[PDB]
Write a protein that binds this ligand. Sequence first.
Ligand SMILES: Nc1ncnc2c1ncn2[C@@H]1O[C@H](COP(=O)(O)OP(=O)(O)O)[C@@H](O)[C@H]1O
Ligand SMILES: [Mg+2]
Length: 338
Amino acid sequence: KNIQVVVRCRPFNLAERKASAHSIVECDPVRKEVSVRTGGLADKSSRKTYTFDMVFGASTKQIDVYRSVVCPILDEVIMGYNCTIFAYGQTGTGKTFTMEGERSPNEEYTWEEDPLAGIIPRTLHQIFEKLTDNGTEFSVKVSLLEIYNEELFDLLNPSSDVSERLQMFDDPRNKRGVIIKGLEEITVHNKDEVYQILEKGAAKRTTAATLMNAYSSRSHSVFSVTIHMKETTIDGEELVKIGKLNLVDLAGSERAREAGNINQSLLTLGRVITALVERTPHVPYRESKLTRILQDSLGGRTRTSIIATISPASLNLKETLSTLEYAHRAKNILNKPE
Ligand SMILES: Nc1ncnc2c1ncn2[C@@H]1O[C@H](COP(=O)(O)OP(=O)(O)O)[C@@H](O)[C@H]1O
Ligand SMILES: [Mg+2]
């Protein structure tokens, strides 16, 4: 499939140690399996096993997630296609760590990416590297919005109130596309401007949370990079390729209809991915804002990836199984024997 579904388990953490929680998740990257202990202390043997396209255990470094998951997708984006990577899972399991990452406790400027850097900085690093290394005329722009309770908020506009809702227009160029009027798109001339853009977005997220209770754990974040590529033929024709990569940090998978329409928006996304995997005619793109925004990138002739993030702690057994169930319903991968 052009649809890859992978699972990442993060290390057991302090908040989980506090509660005398036990470790219940075992990852087998070679067999691409996740086994979860299902019986608690009274039955430590019973387990439930899932199989995915890739499995990343607690020791997985950021660079290996990038190389395994993003590199093939970025290669297609650079050929002029529109792709999407999602991070899905319970709050606190590592969607933002995977999507954004963290920087060095030492502030010194380096050109290599931080070992803790996530998909977003690494993607921008490789875009500028790949395209400078082969002499292509190119420009890069990025946008960052937040979907909270089915409403769209611009996280990068320097000059508008973050609480101003954004409207979606039809796109006369493409029946699959949408134009988000007023969405700030910032040109990136060098790999480092990305870090300043992520800081601006983080400040806007805090304001949105203070103003509207639009907490990032309850919102879908959509970081979109658009690469505009130009080559001039021998006889002087300018050919334009346009690649787009959407890096989506979904709302936590765990009010009411605030929380309800979170679950419905995520279920709609799940139904879209399942229909794309099964090649069924009815893909419900139009039934949520998230899938409307991403419809032009999800069509079928592109690579899509879902990184399902989970906790290894007994405290989160129910949501871990719910996340694995969601990932398995998105793409039915059967268990091998022995
Ligand atoms: N693979 C990992 N290794 C080390 N720390 C992690 C990992 N994944 C998540 N964390 C840490 O766990 C905390 C919660 O992760 P976060 O990305 O905020 O979860 P989410 O975005 O899914 O709510 C953060 O402090 C983050 O640094
Ligand atoms: Mg997060």
